Structure 1
Amino acid sequence: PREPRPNEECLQILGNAEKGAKFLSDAEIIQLVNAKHIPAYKLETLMETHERGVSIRRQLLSKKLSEPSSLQYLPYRDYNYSLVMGACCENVIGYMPIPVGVAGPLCLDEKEFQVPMATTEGCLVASTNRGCRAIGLGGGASSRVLADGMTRGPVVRLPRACDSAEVKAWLETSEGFAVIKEAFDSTSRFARLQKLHTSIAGRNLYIRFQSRSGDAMGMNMISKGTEKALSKLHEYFPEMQILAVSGNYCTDKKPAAINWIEGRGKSVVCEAVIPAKVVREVLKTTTEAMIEVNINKNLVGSAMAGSIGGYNAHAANIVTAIYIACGQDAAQNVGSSNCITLMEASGPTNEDLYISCTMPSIEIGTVGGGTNLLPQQACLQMLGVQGACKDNPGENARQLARIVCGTVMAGELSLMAALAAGH
């Protein structure tokens, strides 16, 4: 054993650049932190290795818990914290393992994918797998990206609603839009402002900037561009007050009709045709039952519940699983799960099942944020969409959006079949 050296003493070893942390014990570091000498947030930098830093943070936290042994089974060792510091999380005390299953092969646009799904919900992966199998036997699915651009919705305020109208009119002209577009586009190589969407409420003006962002999800880049554009706008209207760079008009991570109607991020449609025989043998139902359930649950049931954009069975399940697996911001599922699922009869006999999923607001990226960590990069890699696509910028993000829509469609197929076979 041993015992803790006084503070002033300990604060010196820390300073000796040939004899630093590593000559101090956990108790000595604890003492230094408690005297408010060391800032606990700097532990991963201040300590010898990053792992130790998180160890020290864990010990400190444990001391303050009603059950000191709470963190025992929270894993923290043998994890690369270098990539998380100053990028992804703060006050780190370990990591939360989420089991990763694989659904597939998903036969989409003449290719095959193996889709990783990080979930703690039993049977979700198996159900998605059955849907994938049905689609595969059906001759594969097809998808298209319909629109692409991340949006940011700042709110500005003018002295009078008349002034707000003037600003809106000026933004609607070709010259004003050109000036704003130049200012916005100057901030990055992928910043290419598309048509603006404005909304007035009294003297509040809400401006929705939209743009592609390469392979990144685009929030940071769009925000930077917006800021620059708002400065430029302020030059012409010095009385304008920028109230908030985010005025809930984007709309980011909230249910909003605007995302459903205008789109946000990527808008995708996927479709497939399942032969009648396959619907019988794999899905254990019939086309007629599937259509009946689809109409009376996904359309009418959602309408009676007063849903905007929730005209599907469980798109949120698949979207969340894939998002967590692939390092996406999982909160964005709120907006990204918007989907409408349609089923119809098809074929020369009206016996085959046509299915389509439409998802207008898939917010997704393959660069930046959570996609900078190796484990999430692995899941992106097994799909073939990891990182930036140098040849055709944004192609990887588009492909990932297509895969997400296809997987959602497989999940819908399976769950709807299960509900229709019923009991």
Structure 2
Amino acid sequence: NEILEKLLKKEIKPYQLDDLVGEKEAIELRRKYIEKISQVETKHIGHYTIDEKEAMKKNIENMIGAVQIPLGFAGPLKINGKYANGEFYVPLATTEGALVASVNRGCSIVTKCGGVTVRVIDDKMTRAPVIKTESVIDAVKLKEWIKENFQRIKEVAESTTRHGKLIDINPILIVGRYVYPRFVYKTGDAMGMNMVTIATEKACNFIEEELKKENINIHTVALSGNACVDKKPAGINLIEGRGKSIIAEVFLKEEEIKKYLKTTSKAIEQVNMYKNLIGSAISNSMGFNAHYANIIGALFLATGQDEAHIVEGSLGITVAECTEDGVYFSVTLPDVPVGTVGGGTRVETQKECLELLGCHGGDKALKFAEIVGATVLAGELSLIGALSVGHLARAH
């Protein structure tokens, strides 16, 4: 009580409440502090089963409760991957109606036709700092020095982490006298948000010192130089890739398309071409798809991924082609940063969804990436197929 009055007078801030009073009681006190400023009473945000101690330590600050996202599931989904095999039930958490229904319909169609073939094309997490040099001459010198002394930098970077490994620094961009070297790391099963930052920091300080020994003065302005590129849509991430680069594909027979999707192959090809290809092209889109972000989002929320990386998951191309036997349908997601350890996967409810996939813990990130790609193709196929049905009806 005496505590609540000091916050209203702004004597103490809500952030030091965890040190004064217990963390669990600090949350009940911060919930009532806003209830009185806004003058409204809350009922639902109070209830949570998640551990408030580890949450305040690794996932949230100034906690007042928890928000509840409705959780559904789509399945069965037969996946023909290299790390994920068998029928799966994908948990999806969204507030949008018809979305889980869309994916669930696509899952059933795909499973009765042999399943999705999905492969992880690449796996890397990047961090591109911005380093200021005195002149372009020093920038050229810095680029050359980094290329020859890679092995030394690798040792310095890898000393910060037991799981991360530096595999390349390419490309190394130069704008005038500013250099953007793209550190490429293997992060194991983690997404590696903070891992690559710690490794890159020591590598930058090491690079900073060794050049000082040769009368070349440089200094790092920021470890995230917006060439990473993190939580933004960028061409470098469409071409060179980032996180897990995934491709999923299916071959459907004309009989299966008419039986389950109630349409024809050339109708799917036409919808995909006018919408996903030409439509995205003339509107200058980087997402030559229809549904990636929607499916990424629901699956990202359930498993505790970084919400902001849905930005990156929306890039990719959907290719649908008329074959002699039926259609070839594929989705290409060159930018999908995921992890099965750390971050939001430790949160209780999100931890459970990964376990329902068999994907919580080590040696399971690639398995998760193959599920992500397979779930996207199911939803994308369901939608393009539904649009092609309308394309056929209106065609007559």
- Residues 1:326 and 2:303 aligned together: yes
1:98 aligns with 2:66: no
- Deviation at residue 36 of structure 1 after TM alignment: 5.6
Q: Which residue of 2 aligns with 1:398?
A: 366
SS of 1:195's equivalent in the other structure is strand
- 1:135 paired with 2:110, answer yes
Deviations along 1:299-348, one digit per CA (max 9) or x if unpaired, are 1111111122x0111100000110000000010010122121111223xx
Give 2:56's aligned amino acid.
M
Q: Shift of the alpha carbon at 1:35?
A: 5.6
- Measured in 1, the distance between the counterparts of 2:48 and 2:293 equals 32
Q: Which residue in 2 is equivalent to 1:374? A: 348
SS at structure 2 position matched to 1:215: coil
What CA distance in whole angstroms lies between the structure 2 residues aligned with 1:255 and 1:103? Answer: 28
CA distance in 2, matches of 1:276, 1:126: 24
Alignment of 1:18-417 (within 5 A): 27-34=1-8, 39-48=13-22, 50-65=23-38, 68-69=39-40, 71-109=42-80, 110-173=85-148, 176-197=149-170, 198-238=172-212, 239-308=217-286, 310-346=287-323, 350-389=324-363, 396-417=364-385
2:328 partner SS: strand
- Distance across 2 between alignment mates of 1:248 and 1:209: 13
Kept in 1: contact 2:74–2:90 (CA 8 A) = yes
Q: How many residues align?
A: 382
Q: Is residue 130–residue 282 contact of structure 1 (8 Å, CA) maintained in 2?
A: no
Q: 1:134 & 1:259 partners in 2: Cα distance?
A: 32
Q: Give 1:274's aligned amino acid.
A: L
* 1:198-222 alpha-carbon deviations (Å, 9 max, x no partner): 0000010001101111111001110
Aligned residues: CA RMSD: 1.5
Q: CA deviation at 1:191?
A: 2.2
In structure 2, distance between residues paired with 1:321 and 1:100: 9
- Runs of 4+ displaced beyond 6 Å: none
C-alpha deviation, 1:386, in angstroms:
0.2
1:169 positional shift:
1.4
C-alpha deviation, 1:45, in angstroms:
4.5
Q: Which amino acid is 2:88 matched to?
A: F
Displacement after TM superposition at 1:42 (Å): 3.1
Pairwise CA distance, 1:150: 0.4
CA distance, structure 1, for counterparts of residue 72 and residue 3 of structure 2: 41
Instruction: State whether residues 24 and 53 of structure 2, in contact with CA within 8 Å, keep that contact through their aligned partners in structure 1.
Output: no
Partner of 1:11 in structure 2?
none
**Which letter does structure 1 place at the counterpart of 2:282?**
M
What SS does the corresponding residue of 2:160 show, helix, strand or coil? coil
Matched residues, percent identical? 43
Q: What secondary structure is seen at the aligned counterpart in 1 of 2:385? A: helix
Matched residue type, 1:29: I
Bigger shift: residues 242-251 or 30-39: 30-39
Counterpart residue identity of residue 100, structure 1? L
- Asked if the contact 1:51/1:76 (under 8 Å) is kept, the reply is no
Are the counterparts in 2 of residues 51 and 77 from structure 1 also a CA contact under 8 Å? no
Residue by residue over 1:359-397, the C-alpha shift from the partner in whole angstroms, topping out at 9 and shown as x without a partner, is 1111000111101111100001011110123xxxxxx11
Q: CA deviation at 1:52?
A: 2.5
Q: TM-score, normalised by structure 2?
A: 0.93
1:85 aligned counterpart, secondary structure: helix
Greater C-alpha radius of gyration: 1
Question: 8 Å contact 2:127–2:228 — kept in the other structure?
Answer: yes
SS at match of 1:251: coil
Which deviations, in whole Å up to 9, do the C-alpha atoms of 1:379-422 show, x marking residues without a partner?
A: 01011110123xxxxxx111111111111100110000111111
Q: Which amino acid aligns with 2:113?
A: G
1:35-60 Cα deviation digits (max 9, x unpaired): 66654213345334x43321110111
Question: 1:393 maps to what in 2?
Answer: none
Other structure's SS at 1:360 match = strand
CA deviations 1:230-255 (Å, max 9, x no partner) are 01101222210111111001000001
Deviations 1:99-152 (A, max 9, x none): 011011111014111111111111111111111111111111111111111000
Mapped contact 1:137–1:274 kept (Cα < 8 A): no
SS in 2 for 1:71: coil
